[PDB]
DNA sequence: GACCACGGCGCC
DNA sequence: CGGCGCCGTGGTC
């Protein structure tokens, strides 16, 4: 019993659609349909039929909305059961997974996807009745955010292709030089991109000591960590590290990105996946524009290739230490709150209470160490690991850990309070009430239990930070539109905007305020803002 | 031509 | 001994 009716569908219908490939900016729309009351309407011509819809409503609504924006159609995404499912349990990441769990079959037919969307929305919307915090997240953050992401994906970012093509040649010559030297020291050619062949050269032929093994197969590891500890053992090691650095950036960024420029837009379009992480973070893929290099000198050159349209500037806004500020709020630790209320640099404050200097006498050597202890405790770093990263005895690493919690006792209290709650309810929660179900919190194997604990007490911090960024994007986007400005990229605690040259300053100031005041905490949120013609100079 | 597992590594 | 996605290799159908 499957009711069929002629195109077009009534208002409020749930859409189903089939793409030739997973990227909506690149996809051919193969079929389109819509279902209401279980009655399914199928479009004779999908592209024409797109014009008849008022909104995109159903599984993966954002994807269809991106394709529609590509065709110059204003078809905003509305209700999407994936978002509901994801808020219920962020392990719900795919239509297939959601259908398997809650009911139905995710197939490759437009009509059935449309019918499935409606059935899943009814089912899932009902499971959320009573869950007012989850429903607030849905109505106020996720659903409106999906429209923000749709415009971000369809706008894309301009890329300096010629610059990257020239950068490619230059890096290739450096790669060729390093390869020759490695062959010389090895005494023969081999595939240097093959870790299996490298393993033999290093540990069988040159007889260097094997330090660690790989997780699944127990091979001798050639990871950067192992090679770092082996720098002094042979001149070939340092050469391999340099090689790895260059080929990593060339094979992942320099060479592939130029070929991903879209013919219609002349820009580069990523995908912002809204139901992909266990914490409420977004992810970026096809290509991933959330891991563009920045740390090393060659990486910074890649950033310069991301630029603004002619007559526009890039506006880069970054939350300063958002996770620690969230931690201050959640824990209520008076010491940690004080640091932020007085506008001091926690990383610099840490180094002072580590090296016994005052906050003025802290060089980057000591702030680099402060970073380690601060993030180490946030993520559950072990004493052994800390002793290695700081190059200190294991016993004084233990003492540093204890001194930290002695200085921030409410943090320790909050961790333990969060885990007990986790053990009891079976999930942990962000400030806004986003949930992550964490099993094995009471596992009888210590290593399993403790791994689960770190996941558990991390999620409220990372997830709250994610909620604040997401909400800021929701509030900011319509202010950007009314100023003729664009949202281009989100990198977890960073936003990149594009604005006309003249309004760039006013957009920068406004965006800063909206982000800083998105949701007031016991501590202020500070936002570093910068303006430039490219991503590097903008952040500089 | 397609797929997948693994080690390895880019970013927050 | 926190959260992601992409690469090349080696193997397979
Ligand atoms: C595994 O976790 C980490 C451990 C670290 C240990 C030592 C050093 C760095 C580390 C970085 C990270 C991850 C997690 C972090 O969110 C991200 C950015 O780290 P930034 O260096 O940008 O820290 P900020 O506070 O922005 O410093 P600043 O910009 O204000 O000077 O990298
Ligand atoms: Mg930073
Ligand atoms: Mg993996």
- Domain at A483, CATH number: 3.30.70.370
Axis-axis angle for helices A409-425, A322-331 (nearest 10):
80
A449 and A360 co-located in one domain: yes
Question: Are A279 and A225 spatial neighbours (Cβ–Cβ below 8 Å)?
Answer: no
Q: Is A283 exposed, middle or buried (0-12, 13-18, 19+ CB in 10 A)?
A: middle
A161 and A306 co-located in one domain: no
Tell me the technique behind this structure: X-ray
A122 and A219 co-located in one domain: no
Residue with tokens 């969307």: A117
**Regarding beta strands A283-285 and A271-273, do their DSSP bridges make them parallel or antiparallel, or are they unpaired?**
antiparallel
Between CA A184 and CA A173 the distance in angstroms is 17
A267 and A139 co-located in one domain: no
Axis-axis angle for helices A161-186, A235-249 (nearest 10):
160
State the residue range of the domain holding A445.
322-465
A312 and A424 co-located in one domain: no
A132 and A95 co-located in one domain: yes
Enter the tokens of residue A61.
């609504």
A146 and A162 co-located in one domain: no
CA of A21 to C1' of B2 (A): 14
Examine the fold and report which residue of A441, A465, A489 is the final residue of a domain before the chain moves on: A465
Ligand 1 pocket: which of A371, A379, A382, A462 to mutate (most atoms <8 Å of CB)? A371
**C-beta atoms surrounding A248 within 10 Å:** 15
Question: Are A332 and A346 spatial neighbours (Cβ–Cβ below 8 Å)?
Answer: no
Examine the fold and report which residue of A234, A256, A271 is the final residue of a domain before the chain moves on: A271
Of A6, A305, A263, A271, nearest to A146 by C-alpha is A271
Reduced to 3 states (helix: H, G, I; strand: E, B; else coil), residue A464 is helix
Between CA A319 and CA A377 the distance in angstroms is 20
Question: Are A67 and A19 spatial neighbours (Cβ–Cβ below 8 Å)?
Answer: yes
For A321, phi then psi, to 5°, come to 45, 55
Instruction: Count, in order, helices (H) and strands (E) of chain A.
Output: 22, 14
Of A18, A65, A9, nearest to A38 by C-alpha is A9
Those residues with Cβ within 8 angstroms of residue A96's Cβ, 6 or more apart along the chain or in another chain: A106
Strand B footprint, Cβ within 7 Å: A 195, 199, 214-219, 221-225, 227, 244-245, 248-249, 252, 288, 290-296, 299, 491-494
Question: Are A317 and A532 spatial neighbours (Cβ–Cβ below 8 Å)?
Answer: no
**Regarding beta strands A494-500 and A312-319, do their DSSP bridges make them parallel or antiparallel, or are they unpaired?**
antiparallel
Examine the fold and report which residue of A271, A306, A334 is the final residue of a domain before the chain moves on: A271
CATH number at residue A174: 1.20.1060.10
Enter the tokens of residue A211.
């330090």
Between CA A475 and CA A144 the distance in angstroms is 9
Between CA A322 and CA A399 the distance in angstroms is 27
Nearest nucleotide (C1') to alpha carbon of A492: B12
CATH number at residue A18: 3.30.420.10
* Structural domains of chain A, count: 4
**Regarding beta strands A4-6 and A39-42, do their DSSP bridges make them parallel or antiparallel, or are they unpaired?**
parallel
Between CA A476 and CA A479 the distance in angstroms is 5
Cα distances from A520 to residues A325, A326, A430, in angstroms, run 11, 11, 15
Q: Is the peptide bond before A8 cis (omega within 30 degrees of 0)?
A: yes
The sign one gets for the Cα dihedral A254, A255, A259, A260 is negative
- Under DSSP, the state recorded for A219 is P
The sign one gets for the Cα dihedral A257, A262, A268, A269 is negative
Residue with tokens 């309004």: A503
Residue with tokens 């050269």: A201
A44 and A143 co-located in one domain: yes
Enter the tokens of residue A36.
């209401």
Between CA A530 and CA A537 the distance in angstroms is 8
A340 and A363 co-located in one domain: yes
Say how many residues make up chain A. 540
Q: Return the ligand number nearest the Cα of A216.
A: 3
Q: Which regions of A393-490 does DSSP assign to beta strands (E)?
A: 427-429, 435-437, 486-490
Between CA A331 and CA A91 the distance in angstroms is 27
CATH number at residue A428: 1.10.150.20
Buried b or exposed e, range A249-276, using 16+ CB within 10 angstroms: bbebbbbebbebeeeeeebbbbbbbbbb
Between CA A100 and CA A113 the distance in angstroms is 14
Between CA A482 and CA A493 the distance in angstroms is 24
- Under DSSP, the state recorded for A232 is G
Q: Return the ligand number nearest the Cα of A214.
A: 3
A437 and A454 co-located in one domain: yes
Between CA A87 and CA A135 the distance in angstroms is 9
Reduced to 3 states (helix: H, G, I; strand: E, B; else coil), residue A492 is coil
Question: Are A459 and A278 spatial neighbours (Cβ–Cβ below 8 Å)?
Answer: yes
A263 and A290 co-located in one domain: no
A361 and A445 co-located in one domain: yes
């Amino acid at each position: 019993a499957l009711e069929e009716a002629p195109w077009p569908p009534p208002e409020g219908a749930f859409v189903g659609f089939v793409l030739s490939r997973k990227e909506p900016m690149w996809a051919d729309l193969l079929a389109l349909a819509a279902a209401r009351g279980g009655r399914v309407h199928r479009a004779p011509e999908p592209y024409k039929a797109l014009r008849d819809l008022k909104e995109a409503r159903g599984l993966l609504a954002k994807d269809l909305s991106v394709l529609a924006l590509r065709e110059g159609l204003g078809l905003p995404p509305g209700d999407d059961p994936m978002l509901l499912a994801y808020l219920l349990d962020p392990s719900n990441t795919t239509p297939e997974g959601v259908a398997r769990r809650y009911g139905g079959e995710w197939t490759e037919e437009a009509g059935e996807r449309a019918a499935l969307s409606e059935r899943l929305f009814a089912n899932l919307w009902g499971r959320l009745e009573g869950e007012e915090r989850l429903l607030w997240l849905y109505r106020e953050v996720e659903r409106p955010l999906s429209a923000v992401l749709a415009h971000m994906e369809a706008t894309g970012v301009r890329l300096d292709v010629a610059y990257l093509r020239a950068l490619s040649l230059e890096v290739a010559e450096e790669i060729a030089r390093l390869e020759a030297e490695v062959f010389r020291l090895a005494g023969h050619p081999f595939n240097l991109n093959s870790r299996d062949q490298l393993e033999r050269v290093l540990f069988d032929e040159l007889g260097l000591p094997a330090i660690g093994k790989t997780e699944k197969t127990g091979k001798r590891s050639t990871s950067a960590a192992v090679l770092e500890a082996l720098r002094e053992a042979h001149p070939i090691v340092e050469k391999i590290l340099q090689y790895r650095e260059l080929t990593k950036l060339k094979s992942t960024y320099i060479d592939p990105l130029p070929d991903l420029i879209h013919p219609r837009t002349g820009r580069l379009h990523t995908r912002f996946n809204q139901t992909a992480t266990a914490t409420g973070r977004l992810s970026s893929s096809d290509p991933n524009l959330q891991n563009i290099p920045v740390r090393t000198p060659l990486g910074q050159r890649i950033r310069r290739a991301f630029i603004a349209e002619e007559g526009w500037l890039l506006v880069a806004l970054d939350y300063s230490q958002i996770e620690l500020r969230v931690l201050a709020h959640l824990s209520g630790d008076e010491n940690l709150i004080r640091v932020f209320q007085e506008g001091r640099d926690i990383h610099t404050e840490t180094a002072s209470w580590m090296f016994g200097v005052p906050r003025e006498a802290v060089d980057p050597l000591m702030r680099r160490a402060a970073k380690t202890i601060n993030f180490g405790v946030l993520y559950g770093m072990s004493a052994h690991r800390l002793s290695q990263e700081l190059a200190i005895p294991y016993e004084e690493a233990q003492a540093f850990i204890e001194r930290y919690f002695q200085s921030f006792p409410k943090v320790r209290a909050w961790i333990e309070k969060t885990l007990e709650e986790g053990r009891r309810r079976g999930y942990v929660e962000t400030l806004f009430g986003r949930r992550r179900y964490v099993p094995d919190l009471e596992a009888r194997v210590k290593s399993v239990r403790e791994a689960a604990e770190r996941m558990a007490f991390n999620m409220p911090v990372q997830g709250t930070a994610a909620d604040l960024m997401k909400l800021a994007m929701v509030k900011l986007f319509p202010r950007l539109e009314e100023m003729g400005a664009r949202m281009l990229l989100q990198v977890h605690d960073e936003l990149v905007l594009e604005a006309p040259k003249e309004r760039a300053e006013a957009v920068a100031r406004l965006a800063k305020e909206v982000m800083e005041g998105v949701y007031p905490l016991a501590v202020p949120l500070e936002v570093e803002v910068g303006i430039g013609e490219d991503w590097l100079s903008a952040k500089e």
